[PDB]
Amino acid sequence: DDAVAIVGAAGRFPGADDLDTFWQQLRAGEDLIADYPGDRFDGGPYAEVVARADFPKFAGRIEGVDRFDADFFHLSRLEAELMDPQHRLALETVWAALENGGYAPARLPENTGVYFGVSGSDYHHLLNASGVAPDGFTATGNAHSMLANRISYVLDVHGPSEPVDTACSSSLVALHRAVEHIRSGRCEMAIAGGVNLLLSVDTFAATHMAGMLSPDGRCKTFSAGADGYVRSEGVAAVLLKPLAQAQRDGDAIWGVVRGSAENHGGRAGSLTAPNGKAQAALIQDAMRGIDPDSIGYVEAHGTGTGLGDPVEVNALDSAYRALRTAEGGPPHAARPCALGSVKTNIGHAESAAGLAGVLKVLLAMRHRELPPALHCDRLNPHLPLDGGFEVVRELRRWEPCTDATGRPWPLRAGVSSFGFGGANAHVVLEAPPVPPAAPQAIVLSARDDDRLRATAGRLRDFLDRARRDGHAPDLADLAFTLQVGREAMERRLGFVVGSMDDVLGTLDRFFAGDEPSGWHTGGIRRGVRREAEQAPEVTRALHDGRLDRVTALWCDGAPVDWQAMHPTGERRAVRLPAYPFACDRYWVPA
Amino acid sequence: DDAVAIVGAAGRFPGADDLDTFWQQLRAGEDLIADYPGDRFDGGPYAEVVARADFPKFAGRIEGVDRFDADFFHLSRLEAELMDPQHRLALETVWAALENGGYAPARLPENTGVYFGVSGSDYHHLLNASGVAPDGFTATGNAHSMLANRISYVLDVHGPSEPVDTACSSSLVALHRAVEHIRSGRCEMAIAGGVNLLLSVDTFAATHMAGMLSPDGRCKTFSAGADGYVRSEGVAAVLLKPLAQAQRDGDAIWGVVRGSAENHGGRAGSLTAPNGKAQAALIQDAMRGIDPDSIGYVEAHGTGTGLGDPVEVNALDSAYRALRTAEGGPPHAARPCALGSVKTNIGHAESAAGLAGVLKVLLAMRHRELPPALHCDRLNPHLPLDGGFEVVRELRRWEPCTDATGRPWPLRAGVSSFGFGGANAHVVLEAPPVPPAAPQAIVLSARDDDRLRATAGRLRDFLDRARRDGHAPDLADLAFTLQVGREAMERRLGFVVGSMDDVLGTLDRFFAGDEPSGWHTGGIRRGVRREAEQAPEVTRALHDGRLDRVTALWCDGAPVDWQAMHPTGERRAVRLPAYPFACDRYWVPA
Ligand SMILES: [Cl-]
Ligand SMILES: [Cl-]
């Protein structure tokens, strides 16, 4: 009887390795398209297999695509080297989202679903073209099913585990499928994600022949000179949970999914032609119950193809128009709804394209701002003259829509995503609800001591830029999140504070490599126990109020039941930095 | 408030090109595993790329994998040559199921969903290994999304269109996803299918290294000497519709889906190890509400791996045992439930494996018989001694289970399917309900005149073996199905009968190539109009009762509204032979 909260998020896109960087770039009107391939293939001969190919040499690229923390997931160098980098970045980003939402694997319900969009097997082609004989790891390393299932394996969850391949709309359909299963009760929480990586020539060449790649490698969405798109890399995941449940548990909500629909184009004239009447039917379906005067922004699919862009925008107009009419509202809108597309910034990330859209909107919601569209100085002549939709070409404050009586809705927005095979999805998002109005144990951990210093360092840094700006987390909330929002790993750090410069000071000294002065250090090595167990000594150490002893016990491996301590109603989760995954290189073997 | 009917079906498996042949072979205890590759690659050099590889050289193969009617779907030889044979056989088999269920595309609701399981891109590897430069058709011809979307494009439907990749369980999950969407109202009818074709070395070699292929290439499921499995080709589709709606419309029901569940293994010890406690949880989930004393047969996943088989069977025991207990029934079963696996006949068809299971069961239901399991003379020592489940090693009549009072349930059965990544689905099927207790227009059509003679011929043949056995269709029902269950194509035949030797005689003379004597001939060539239109002349020709004139008008292209004629309550659909697709060869280009 309620909607689905987005409670955690992560992404890597051209130029940005985290969502905070991404948003910064969108806001500045940064164009992040670069050259293809770059140093990607320079190790072997495949480098000029690329140079000989026909297509326009551009892409939005992720830096460090060959990098992966294989020890984190306990993998052979060999198992990792034959593993599609798409699976590798999926793992890391999914983990990142989990942490950002404040979820250690053991906090997840056992029926957590996993729906991850993915389209290409570029790497597997790359292996073959390099002469790499088959191994048992190759099959595992390259089946799309494994992308999803390996995640469910890593997290020990038992909800449905599916790759989604609807081409260019895969990740939006993911989000939709996850929402279905949450609304239906099959899942209590779910992970929806998408990934796309450009690791071979095959699709580049083919798309070019199709006449779909623009000669200057830009997605000039809405422009008059739109003439194709440019492929991009990207990876994203979001953690999902029923809104009501998420409010009681004090999760940090990014946004709410109010509506959501998918459909297929049917016979559209050609296999890969856009179908406006289907795109309309879709939106009306997702906007069922929602007031269209209530939508403030639409993140359009917006490939920047000369045909696709006006079709989409006319279909959108046609749909909101149909919607207004149904409820007795006047034929034309009260004011122009804003319109845009992240593809002008980062290009067309295909399987990851949908969620790039979603995250842009959620970020815009956070900062109550709409970023500029790019290459869009001269608008397209086939966009509607009727003034129903405005393209945002100018960084503006995002003011809320407002009712007839004058009531203001929460910020709302639509996102579209259309596969080149005719599979379409559309999501309607809403801004998160306003959250309503003692010594603590600080607990860190990583795999290596090196990674522990790393975690502590980045925590120090984040914590004080959040005081030089006053956005400091509440202490018990910070401690709460480090306790339950993090997997307790092999190497452990722990200590006890009463204030937060107590925190910041203790971190600065550990990083600088001092011998302990009131902090503790511990270790171990070698399923997921979601059961609540607590060591007999810890149980009565807590009885006394000797926090520090608990902390030091926890470091040499004493099981603790952290959620037992806090008022089960009170605590709220906090967005801290994610794990500093090692930058080990795993590429094609020799 | 009801279950989902299976209203149409088709399949191609090792040795059998239709379901009637399939069943025949299962009943006889035929082992259809052959050698790999065969003449498949003999055209080029890839033939001894295979010979040099390591794996045991066996597979269940489909004959005529390079064959396809590309003109039927209006395709370039070039577009078809770069098109994954998996997409090609999908198209043809989906079409076959549609016809078998008595559905022309125009009889489908516009929100028909399409969920098709598929795992490998073997062909795309084959193209690259042959040196085939990329084309725009390659990308389209090999993306998994296209497999599904091209079908929605061909049928002009707008429900969700998805490939499903959960590895070895893909097609069972398909069936499950389609059922979800029917039960939820998103779809009014849906198509679930699966396909698997062995067109490259890559997966063969890899699986072998994994130690999963048996040295003698047989799935010796339940045997004591089970030591691996053998890969198989296969393609299947089923048409789905809400039971109630299907009864009012008098569709020919294959079976009912009573329950259905999917889940994932989570952490099972290794990525590809079976997880009994998950397999149990799954079954209990799907069997929710169903009485386990009510199940007569289980088509087990049954790979014939030494470990997997007992695990599955113990998990099954553990589950039914848990079920019985919940309702106050005695600890042990009233009588042993039968157990089996089509994999002993046809091997392990991977993505198509699930539906092979389903269709076997539906066929067994039709004929009220259970076929023998194979290579199973000496049972596995880790199967339960408790007598809960019996392996059928002997062709037996399938007698119904029966209540305590003595009431007999309809025949019921369970089917399992477990992906090697940990994604599991389980379906519970139930036998179809017992169907309760004038001149007609006979109408045929094909693309070519050659294909028309073909259709007429096979119709003659089927119709009289169905009288030499007395299984003749009712005439108006036969005519009804040819009218509305068939796409009206380019070349047309029509005539009017009062009896069925009138039918059989008129077909015999047309086939033999006589000049017409009371039959008509017509043609045309060059979206799907689900609208009911009817030419002004036809409208009043019907007013008169001049059937023949309608028939002859319909041949030169006069639109007819056939469902307007019949009592909209009365008519029932009939299983006739499907379209005789041309056997044109489309393989790797030079
Ligand atoms: Cl812990
Ligand atoms: Cl017609």
Q: What are phi and psi of A12, to 5 degrees?
A: -125, 130
Query: What residues contact A188, with CB distance under 8 A and at least 6 apart?
Result: A109, A111, A112, A182, A241, A242, A245
Query: What residues contact A334, with CB distance under 8 A and at least 6 apart?
Result: A293
State both tokens at B143. 């993306």
Angular region, B156: left φ>0, alpha ψ -120 to 50, beta rest = left
C-beta atoms surrounding A36 within 10 Å: 22
| Cβ–Cβ under 8 Å, residues A337 and A363 | no
State both tokens at B272. 């590809």
Residues B219 and B142 grouped into a single domain: yes
State both tokens at A339. 């319109």
Distance, CA of A385 to CA of A377 (rounded, Å): 17
Ligand nearest to the CA of residue B445, numbered in listed order: 2
Of the candidates A153, A210, A263, which has its C-beta nearest B136's C-beta? A210
Helix (H) or strand (E) run with residue A260 in it:
strand A255-264
Contacts A114 to B, Cβ<8 Å: 264
Nearest in space to B257 (alpha carbons), one of B396, B152, B371, B410? B410
| Cβ–Cβ under 8 Å, residues A152 and B264 | yes
| Cβ–Cβ under 8 Å, residues B434 and B446 | no
Nearest in space to A114 (alpha carbons), one of A26, A238, A298, A264? A238
Distances (CA, A) of B264 to A46, A162, B298, B434, B449: 38, 10, 20, 37, 51
C-beta atoms surrounding A346 within 10 Å: 30
CA A416 to chain centre: 16
State both tokens at A208. 């070019």
| Dihedral sign for Cα atoms in the order A79, A85, A88, A90 | negative
Residues A437 and A551 grouped into a single domain: no
Look at the block and give the residue holding tokens 């923390």: A69
DSSP designation for A18: S
C-beta atoms surrounding B219 within 10 Å: 31
State both tokens at B7. 């209203």
| Cβ–Cβ under 8 Å, residues B339 and B391 | yes
Amino acid at B562: W
DSSP string, A197-258: ----SHHHHHHHHTT-B-TT----TTBTT---B-BB-EEEEEEEEEHHHHHHTT----EEEE
Helix axis angle, B500-511 to B475-484, nearest 10°: 50
Q: What are phi and psi of A555, to 5 degrees?
A: -75, -35
Contacts B260 to A, Cβ<8 Å: none
How remote is the CA of residue A489 from the centroid of ligand 1, in Å?
9
Nearest in space to B371 (alpha carbons), one of B348, B350, B394, B353? B394
Query: What residues contact A474, with CB distance under 8 A and at least 6 apart?
Result: A572, A574
Contact across the interface for B423 and A203, Cβ inside 8 Å: no
Distance, CA of A117 to CA of A172 (rounded, Å): 8
| Cβ–Cβ under 8 Å, residues B338 and B392 | yes
> Hey, is the C-beta of B271 within 8 angstroms of any chain A C-beta?
yes
| Cβ–Cβ under 8 Å, residues B156 and B527 | yes
Distance, CA of A349 to CA of A382 (rounded, Å): 25
Helix (H) or strand (E) run with residue A100 in it:
helix A85-100
| Cβ–Cβ under 8 Å, residues A263 and A285 | yes
Residues A470 and A497 grouped into a single domain: no
- Point out which residues pair with A415 in neighbouring strands: A299, A427
> What's the CA dihedral at A333, A336, A338, A339 to 10 degrees?
80
State both tokens at A359. 């995250």
Q: Both ends of chain B: CA-CA distance in Å?
A: 56
Of the candidates A134, A145, A421, which has its C-beta nearest B419's C-beta? A145
CA A367 to chain centre: 17
Residues A461 and A511 grouped into a single domain: no
Of the candidates B110, B152, B209, which has its C-beta nearest A136's C-beta? B209
Instruction: Please tell me the distance in Å from A267's CA to the nearest CA on chain B.
Output: 5
| Cβ–Cβ under 8 Å, residues B167 and B301 | no
In degrees, rounded to 5, the angle at the alpha carbon of residue A113 between the alpha carbons of residues A112 and A119 is 150
| Cβ–Cβ under 8 Å, residues A176 and A427 | yes
Amino acid at A523: G
| Cβ–Cβ under 8 Å, residues B462 and B577 | yes
State both tokens at A171. 């990740």
Look at the block and give the residue holding tokens 């010890």: B269
State both tokens at A72. 């984190």
Residues within 8 A of A (CB atoms), B 176-205 only: 180, 184, 201-203, 205
Query: What residues contact B499, with CB distance under 8 A and at least 6 apart?
Result: B475
State both tokens at B99. 């016809």
| Cβ–Cβ under 8 Å, residues A268 and A422 | yes
Distance, CA of A386 to CA of B32 (rounded, Å): 66
Q: What's B284's domain CATH number?
A: 3.40.47.10
Ligand nearest to the CA of residue A565, numbered in listed order: 1
How remote is the CA of residue A417 from the centroid of ligand 2, in Å?
36
Do the strands B337-340 and B255-264 form a parallel or antiparallel pair, or are they unpaired?
unpaired
Residues A55 and A150 grouped into a single domain: yes
Nearest in space to A581 (alpha carbons), one of A179, A18, A5, A203? A18
How remote is the CA of residue A442 from the centroid of ligand 1, in Å?
12
In degrees, rounded to 5, the angle at the alpha carbon of residue B289 between the alpha carbons of residues B283 and B292 is 60
A132: nearest CA partner in chain B: B202
Its domain, for residue B494, covers 477-568
Nearest in space to A257 (alpha carbons), one of A180, A161, A166? A180
Residues B430 and B560 grouped into a single domain: no
Q: Both ends of chain A: CA-CA distance in Å?
A: 56
- Point out which residues pair with A491 in neighbouring strands: A446
Residues B563 and B455 grouped into a single domain: no
DSSP designation for A533: -
DSSP designation for A382: T
DSSP designation for B322: H
Contacts A155 to B, Cβ<8 Å: 266
Distance, CA of B33 to CA of B198 (rounded, Å): 13
| Cβ–Cβ under 8 Å, residues A561 and A442 | no
Amino acid at A38: G
- Number of H helices and E strands in chain A, helices first, is 20, 20
Strand locations in A285-375 (E): 297-299, 337-340, 369-370
Residues A442 and A555 grouped into a single domain: no
- Point out which residues pair with B1 in neighbouring strands: none
Distance, CA of B280 to CA of B284 (rounded, Å): 6
DSSP designation for A486: S
- Number of H helices and E strands in chain B, helices first, is 20, 20
Contacts B210 to A, Cβ<8 Å: 136, 139
Distance, CA of B35 to CA of B61 (rounded, Å): 8
Residues B350 and B491 grouped into a single domain: no
Distance, CA of B153 to CA of B157 (rounded, Å): 7
Domain count, chain B: 2
Q: What are phi and psi of A65, to 5 degrees?
A: -75, -20
Nearest in space to B375 (alpha carbons), one of B416, B345, B337? B345
Give the resolution value in Å: 2.9
DSSP designation for B336: P
Amino acid at B2: D
Residues B525 and B381 grouped into a single domain: no
Distances (CA, A) of A547 to A500, A554, A567, A574, B8: 16, 11, 17, 22, 67
| Cβ–Cβ under 8 Å, residues A80 and A586 | yes
SS3 assignment for A388-407: CEEECCCCEECCCCECCCCC
Distance, CA of A342 to CA of A351 (rounded, Å): 14
Distance, CA of A545 to CA of A540 (rounded, Å): 9
Distances (CA, A) of B462 to B250, B348, B478, B496, B576: 22, 31, 12, 19, 8
Distance, CA of B471 to CA of A126 (rounded, Å): 57
Nearest in space to A75 (alpha carbons), one of A133, A134, A141, A28? A141
Specify the length of chain B in residues. Answer: 590
Burial class (CB in 10 A: 0-12, 13-18, 19+), B382: middle
Contacts B202 to A, Cβ<8 Å: 128, 134, 138-139
State both tokens at A484. 């339950």
- Point out which residues pair with A192 in neighbouring strands: A115, A238
Distance, CA of B35 to CA of B217 (rounded, Å): 9
Distance, CA of B316 to CA of B277 (rounded, Å): 10
Residues A364 and A439 grouped into a single domain: yes
C-beta atoms surrounding B290 within 10 Å: 17
Distance, CA of A530 to CA of B266 (rounded, Å): 13
Distance, CA of B20 to CA of B366 (rounded, Å): 11
| Cβ–Cβ under 8 Å, residues A14 and A62 | yes
CA B309 to chain centre: 25
Strand locations in A475-565 (E): 491-497, 519-522
DSSP designation for B402: B
Do the strands B161-164 and B112-117 form a parallel or antiparallel pair, or are they unpaired?
parallel
Burial class (CB in 10 A: 0-12, 13-18, 19+), B468: exposed
Q: What's B560's domain CATH number?
A: 1.10.1240.100
Distance, CA of A546 to CA of A324 (rounded, Å): 63
Strand locations in A358-505 (E): 369-370, 389-391, 396-397, 412-418, 423-430, 440-446, 491-497
Do the strands A255-264 and A423-430 form a parallel or antiparallel pair, or are they unpaired?
antiparallel
In degrees, rounded to 5, the angle at the alpha carbon of residue B530 between the alpha carbons of residues B525 and B536 is 70
- Mutation test of the interface with chain B: which of A74, A86, A126, A149, choosing the one with the most B Cβ atoms within 10 A? A149
Residues A155 and A287 grouped into a single domain: yes
Specify the length of chain A in residues. Answer: 590
